[PDB]
Amino acid sequence: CEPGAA
Amino acid sequence: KGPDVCFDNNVLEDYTDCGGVSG
Amino acid sequence: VIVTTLLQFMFACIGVQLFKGKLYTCSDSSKQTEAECKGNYITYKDGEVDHPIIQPRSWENSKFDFDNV
Amino acid sequence: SCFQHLVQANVRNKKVLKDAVNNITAKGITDYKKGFSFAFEQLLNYNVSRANCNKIIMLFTDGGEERAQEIFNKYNKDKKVRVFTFSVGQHNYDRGPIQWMACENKGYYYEIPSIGAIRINTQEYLDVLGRPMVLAGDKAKQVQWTNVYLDALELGLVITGTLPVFNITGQFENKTNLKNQLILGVMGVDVSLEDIKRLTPRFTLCPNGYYFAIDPNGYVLLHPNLQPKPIGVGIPTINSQEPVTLDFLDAELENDIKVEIRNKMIDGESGEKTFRTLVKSQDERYIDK
Amino acid sequence: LEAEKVQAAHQWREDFASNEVVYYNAKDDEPGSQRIKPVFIEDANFGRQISYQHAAVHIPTDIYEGSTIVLNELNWTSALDEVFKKNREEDPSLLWQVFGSATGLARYYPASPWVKIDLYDVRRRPWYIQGAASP
Amino acid sequence: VALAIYIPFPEDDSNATNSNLERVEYLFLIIFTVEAFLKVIAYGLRNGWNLLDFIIVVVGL
Amino acid sequence: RICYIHKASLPRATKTCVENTCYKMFIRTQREYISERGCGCPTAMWPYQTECCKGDRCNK
Ligand SMILES: *[C@@H]1O[C@H](CO)[C@@H](O[C@@H]2O[C@H](CO)[C@@H](O[C@@H]3O[C@H](CO)[C@@H](O[C@@H]4O[C@H](CO)[C@@H](O)[C@H](O)[C@H]4NC(C)=O)[C@H](O)[C@H]3NC(C)=O)[C@H](O)[C@H]2NC(C)=O)[C@H](O)[C@H]1NC(C)=O
Ligand SMILES: *[C@@H]1O[C@H](CO)[C@@H](O[C@@H]2O[C@H](CO)[C@@H](O[C@@H]3O[C@H](CO)[C@@H](O)[C@H](O)[C@H]3NC(C)=O)[C@H](O)[C@H]2NC(C)=O)[C@H](O)[C@H]1NC(C)=O
Ligand SMILES: *[C@@H]1O[C@H](CO)[C@@H](O[C@@H]2O[C@H](CO)[C@@H](O)[C@H](O)[C@H]2NC(C)=O)[C@H](O)[C@H]1NC(C)=O
Ligand SMILES: *[C@@H]1O[C@H](CO)[C@@H](O[C@@H]2O[C@H](CO)[C@@H](O)[C@H](O)[C@H]2NC(C)=O)[C@H](O)[C@H]1NC(C)=O
Ligand SMILES: *[C@@H]1O[C@H](CO)[C@@H](O)[C@H](O)[C@H]1NC(C)=O
Known part of the structure; x- marks a missing residue:
């Protein structure tokens, strides 16, 4: 899956 | 279930091979 | 002036027998011999383990040594 | 960590311990006396699953003036x-x-002076641990045989054999024994998972039949759901x-009966079983019986 | 057995410059050690340019391949290649056969060029750690 | 000399020597308190260095 | 056997030798430019440093 954000 | 062969605590082992007394 | 330069020569002579060739160092801190300080080694940018960069290993003397008078 | 005993070194249990350190x-x-009283008491549980083998403590400090000769004489006196x-560090x-x-x-x-010596130093405790095995x-x-892993030279999913080699020079007289307590190295021959699949033909079965081993x-070791990609941790x-x-239970849907078969197959038994199951479809959108 | 017997007669050398060892360094496109230029043939089974004549040698980046310890191995890990060949000839299905030495160098057969930054060390591989000790 | 030995540690750490010098610098405060107690009821603080001694003593207590 | 020895570091002229160690005399900071190759393992004055080899023309 593609990464997220943090 | 783990391996049934184990190898530790042998009598004829030279423990006097540290890195502070032999270096 | 002559006294000052004579004391300069004197202190240089004492310092030679004190730091004669002991001021060598390697780029990699884990090697402490010119023979060992060879090839390449890994250097990490700003102490980050995720950015390794290959550098050569060099036996470099200090900028101001004490090898001779 | 959130763990209070010795846990297996999985890929998941090894991520909780690397996100907490x-x-x-x-x-x-x-306080070394309190610290080493914990370590010697955590390797005394025997309530949980353990390897029951080499029991090492791996102290990570900088320096001190305490020898803790009492703690090292209450618990660890039989060696x-x-x-x-x-x-660790420059100090x-x-x-x-x-x-001592x-x-x-x-x-x-x-000794770990800098970040460059971390990779060569935290791998040599396998030379000390190999002394009782060399002798x-x-x-x-x-x-x-190792677990299924991706080859370094891109080849797929392979398992590797293993056989250590011994420094045995001067074994005719047996007089040196100074460096002969360390292994020369470890060999290995790779067996690709595709090679094993050739030995289990499946074209005499319907598409719903298959083989698997654990x-x-x-x-x-082989399963229709095992894909050549590394597993996820989070x-x-x-x-x-x-x-x-x-794991086998995480490759297909889990039941109460399938756990019974998994335990029997781990033990090394033989048998048969017929039982209605919920089998997930290949498109991961349907389930039938 | 052949890696044990051959090591028992290495006759430890000190200056590996007058007599040079011949080996194929995988990580390449130097005095004291001669390299070989292999022929290579794209093949099935494997997927890379494999060579059925010698075995490549992988030495990690932070290991100088002309030190007196690395060069002293590469001399006794050269009778292995005759056993790397008889094994495959008897059973043509053999895949990679590798000898992971304790000095960081690994000699695998058949020879093939190695795969950004390189951080491979044979002493950390799972197939090596499981055989160097017990659980 | 006690202050010379003391050695500081990053973020509250301490060895045994720092756990002994903090004990010694209680006798080294009682001595000065005893000295300062006699002078006031003997000499009635305005001598300068006597004032400095008084400030360091009261700050010590 | 052959490594170029000269006094003026700029022209880099060639001179014969007999020692089996070819050296490399460079500055302690600007090491890219090689001031003086040659034969033997001499002593470096200031500001200079020497690396010595095992064969002829090993310095490069
Ligand atoms: C398998 O085990 C055998 C022994 O069981 C082992 O063979 C031994 O190898 C060492 C190499 O270090 C030989 O050492 C000779 O004697 C001294 C002692 O080291 C060396 O002199 C110095 O050695 C140190 C090493 O720390 C070095 O830093 C120093 O630079 C050396 N001195 C100088 C002036 O350079 C000698 O150099 C060395 N002999 C020669 C001819 O060079 C032992 O003699 C070997 N023992 C036997 C019985 O042969 C072998 O390496 C092991 N196999 C592997 C793969 O490690
Ligand atoms: C470690 O270093 C050397 C690098 O190749 C090798 O030295 C070789 O030793 C061989 C045996 O001593 C020599 O072969 C011939 O052996 C016969 C004895 O049956 C003798 O005639 C001579 O000693 C020798 N020469 C001739 C012409 O017959 C090799 O010549 C010699 N090679 C070199 C380059 O000197 C060692 O073999 C090597 N060890 C291993 C295990 O490879
Ligand atoms: C599990 O470990 C604990 C301590 O680590 C063992 O201690 C027992 O705890 C229970 C209740 O606290 C009681 O049985 C006793 O008070 C403790 N001692 C013994 C000897 O039982 C406990 O025994 C372990 N469980 C086992 C071995 O099944
Ligand atoms: C798949 O879904 C079924 C139905 O939702 C679940 O199995 C039921 O679970 C409940 C609660 O334990 C039981 O009371 C029922 O008897 C079960 N149905 C059966 C056994 O047919 C469960 O979520 C899944 N079934 C599994 C895992 O076997
Ligand atoms: C190896 O396996 C093949 C088939 O898998 C078999 O025919 C052969 O006897 C085995 N042994 C050898 C030495 O080839």
Whole structure:
């Protein structure tokens, strides 16, 4: 899956 | 279930091979 | 002036027998011999383990040594 | 960690322990006597699953002036637990008691001055741990098969054999025995998972039939759901090194009966079983019976 | 057995410059050691340019391949290649056969060029750690 | 000399020597308190260095 | 056997030798430019440093 954000 | 062969605590082992007394 | 330069020569002579060739160092801190300080080694940018960069290993003397008078 | 005992070194249990030693903060006075009373008491549980084998303690300090000769005489007086001491960092503290801990406890003193020596130093405790196996003679020469992992040279999913080699120069007289306590190296021959699949033909069955085999851990060796990609450990975040260990119960839907078959197959038994199941479809959108 | 017997007669040398060892360094496109230029043939089974004549040698980046310890191995890990060949000839299905030495160098057969930054060390591989000790 | 030995540690750490010098710098305060107690009821603080001694003593207590 | 020895570091002229160690005399900071190759393992004055080899023309 593609990464997220943090 | 783990391996049934184990190898530790042998009598004829030279423990006097540290890195502070032999270096 | 002559006294000052004579004391300069004197202190240089004492310092030679004190730091004669002991001021060598390697780029990699884990090697402490010119023979060992060879090839390449890994250097990490700003102490980050995720950015390794290959550098050569060099036996470099200090900028101001004490090898001779 | 959230763990209070010894846990197996999975790919998941090894991520909880690497996200918690990446968060610690330094504050307070040091106390080796309390610290080593914890370590010797956590390797005494026997309530939980354990390897029941080499029992090592791996101290990560900088320096100190405490020898803790009492703690090392209450628990570890029969020389059953090794103690490896690491003196990490660039500092000036007395590394004297630390060198004494390793020698008196059948260990080794390792020094990590900078980040460049981390990779070569935290891999040599396998030379100390290999001493009791080298002296065992030709009874430790047993082929061992690793878990399924991706090859370094891109080849797919492979399993590798293993057989150590012994420094046996001067064995005719048996007089040196100074460096003959270390292994020369470890060999290996790769067996690709595709090679095993040729030995299990499936075209005489309907598409719903298949073969699978498991480790004595539940990890599948071959399975229709085993894909040539590394397994996941959590939600990714952006700001071949690990084996492909997929458990049998996590490869297909889990039942109460399937756990019974998994335990029997781990034990090494033989048998048959017929039972209605819920089998997930290949498109991961349907389920039938 | 052949890696044990051959090591028992290495006759430890000190200056590996007058007599040079011949080996194929995988990580390449130097005095004291001669390299070989292999022929290579794209093949099935494997997917890379494999060579059925010698075995490549992988030495990690932070290991100087002309030190007196690395060069002293490469001399006794050269009778292995005759056993790397008889094994495959008897059973043509053999895949990679590798000898992971304790000095960091690994000699695998059949020879093939190695795969950004390189951080491979044979002493950390799972197939090596499981055989160097017990659980 | 006690202050010379003391050695500071990052973020509250301490060895045994710092756990003994903090004990010694209680006798080293009682001595000065005893000295300062006799002078006031003997000499009635305005000598300068006597005033400095008084400030360091009261800050010590 | 052959490594170029000269006094003026700029022209880099060639001179014969007999020692089996070819050296490399460079500055302690600007090491890219090689001031003086040659034969033997001599002593470096200031500001200079020497690396010595095992064969002829090993320095490169
Ligand atoms: C398998 O085990 C055998 C022994 O069981 C082992 O063979 C031994 O190898 C060492 C190499 O270090 C030989 O040492 C000779 O004697 C001294 C002692 O080291 C060396 O002189 C110095 O050695 C140190 C090593 O720390 C070095 O830093 C130093 O530079 C050396 N001195 C100088 C002036 O350079 C000698 O150099 C060395 N002999 C020669 C001819 O060079 C032992 O003699 C070997 N023992 C036997 C019985 O042959 C072998 O290496 C092991 N196999 C592997 C793969 O490690
Ligand atoms: C370690 O270093 C050397 C690098 O190749 C090798 O030295 C070789 O030793 C061989 C045996 O001593 C020599 O072969 C011939 O052996 C016969 C004895 O049956 C003798 O005639 C001579 O000693 C020798 N020469 C001739 C012409 O017959 C090799 O010539 C010699 N090679 C070199 C380059 O000198 C060692 O073999 C090597 N060890 C291993 C295990 O490879
Ligand atoms: C599990 O470990 C604990 C301590 O680590 C063992 O201690 C027992 O705890 C229970 C209740 O606290 C009681 O049985 C006793 O008070 C403790 N001692 C013994 C000897 O039982 C406990 O025994 C372990 N469980 C086992 C071995 O099944
Ligand atoms: C798949 O879904 C079924 C139905 O939702 C679940 O199995 C039921 O679970 C409940 C609660 O334990 C039981 O009371 C029922 O008897 C079960 N149905 C059966 C056995 O047919 C469960 O979530 C899944 N079934 C599994 C895992 O076997
Ligand atoms: C190897 O396996 C093949 C088939 O898998 C078999 O025919 C052969 O006898 C085995 N042994 C050898 C030495 O080839």
